[PDB]
A paper describes a structure:
The efficiency with which [name] thwarts β-lactam chemotherapy stems from its ability to hydrolyze penicillin, cephalosporin, and carbapenem classes of β-lactams. [name] is a 307-amino-acid protein that bears an N-terminal Tat signal peptide and is natively exported by the Tat pathway in mycobacteria.
Given that earlier [name] crystal structures were for a truncated version of the enzyme that lacked the first 40 amino acids, we decided to crystallize the full-length version of the enzyme. Crystals were present in the P21 space group, and diffraction data to 2.8 Å resolution were used to solve the final structure with molecular replacement methods and the structure of the truncated [name] enzyme. Despite the inclusion of the authentic N-terminal residues, the overall structure of full-length [name] is very similar to the previously solved structure for truncated [name], a monomer containing an α domain and an α/β domain. Interestingly, our I105F substitution reintroduces an aromatic side chain in this position. While this structural model is insufficient to unequivocally establish how this mutation improves catalytic efficiency, it suggests that Ile105 of [name] may function as a ‘gatekeeper’ residue that regulates substrate accessibility to the enzyme active site.
Numbering used by the authors: 28 to 83, 86 to 145, 145A, 145B, 145C, 145D, 146 to 291
Write the structure that this text describes.
């Protein structure tokens, strides 16, 4: 049979490169397919960005109002344009950056992180405090979805991002109150219904953060719980460089790969 042969069949069917990592657990072996190849973050980074901001500041910091203007509003931003008059709090921005992939919100949080490159260095720094020596962020939104294939900037690997998300949600990288805020935002995500959620049976709990870009880029990083409460971490990333910048991302690919994963964890 063999799970690798199946991921390769998915690649051929969807004409795409697929990366899958599920960290090991006390009872299950790691699941790997191109787990160490680089793929663009796209929006998957907005999840550990929220953790970085939570980590560097006391809970009271979520109450801080942030003001911005229309020139600040770039990339997909369903929440931010409805609050240019009023501004948004760090907390509301965290909510928006995760549940709606609001790109403007991802940029303000990067700005809040501080330093050179709009926050990208501080952020990459934050990933390093978690052992992730591979991932890097260099541009803000949207330039960060546009890097060409082979360019290492604004990339991670399934193996890397899985191990980060595991530390954040199931590990002790954040104290419980902050861990709970992060976990909840990912739990009430609105952008991921046709990706990893779609591939796992309904009676498995699924929290996630999606990513989409050019070159057929489609990602979903998730924490799932079996019907009897057993957690796993699942990172699935894809692109379709064969078709150029205008290549269509295929969400069914991520969902199918997730069903293959579910079958192996079952």
């Amino acid at each position: 049979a063999d799970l690798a042969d199946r991921f390769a069949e998915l690649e051929r069917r969807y004409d795409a490169r697929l990366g899958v990592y599920v960290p090991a657990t006390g009872t299950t072996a790691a699941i790997e397919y191109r787990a160490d190849e680089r793929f663009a973050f796209c929006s998957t980074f907005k999840a550990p960005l929220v953790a970085a901001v939570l980590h560097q500041n006391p809970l009271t910091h979520l109450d801080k109002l942030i003001t911005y203007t229309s020139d600040d509003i770039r990339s997909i931003s369903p929440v931010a344009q409805q609050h240019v008059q009023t501004g948004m709090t760090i907390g509301q921005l965290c909510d928006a950056a995760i549940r709606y992939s609001d790109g403007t919100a991802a940029n303000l949080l990067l700005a809040d992180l501080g330093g050179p490159g709009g926050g990208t260095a501080a952020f990459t720094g934050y990933l390093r405090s978690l052992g992730d020596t591979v991932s890097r962020l260099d541009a803000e939104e949207p330039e960060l979805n546009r890097d060409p294939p082979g360019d290492e900037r604004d990339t991670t690997t399934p193996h890397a991002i899985a191990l980060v998300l595991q530390q954040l949600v199931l590990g002790n990288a954040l104290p419980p109150d902050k861990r709970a805020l992060l976990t909840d935002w990912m739990a009430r995500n609105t952008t991921g219904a046709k990706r990893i959620r779609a591939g796992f049976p309904a009676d498995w709990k699924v929290i996630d953060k999606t990513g989409t870009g050019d070159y057929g880029r489609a990602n979903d990083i998730a924490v799932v719980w079996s019907p009897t409460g057993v957690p796993y971490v699942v990172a699935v990333m894809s692109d379709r460089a064969g078709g150029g910048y205008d290549a269509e991302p295929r969400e069914a690919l991520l969902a199918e790969a997730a069903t293959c994963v579910a079958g192996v964890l079952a």
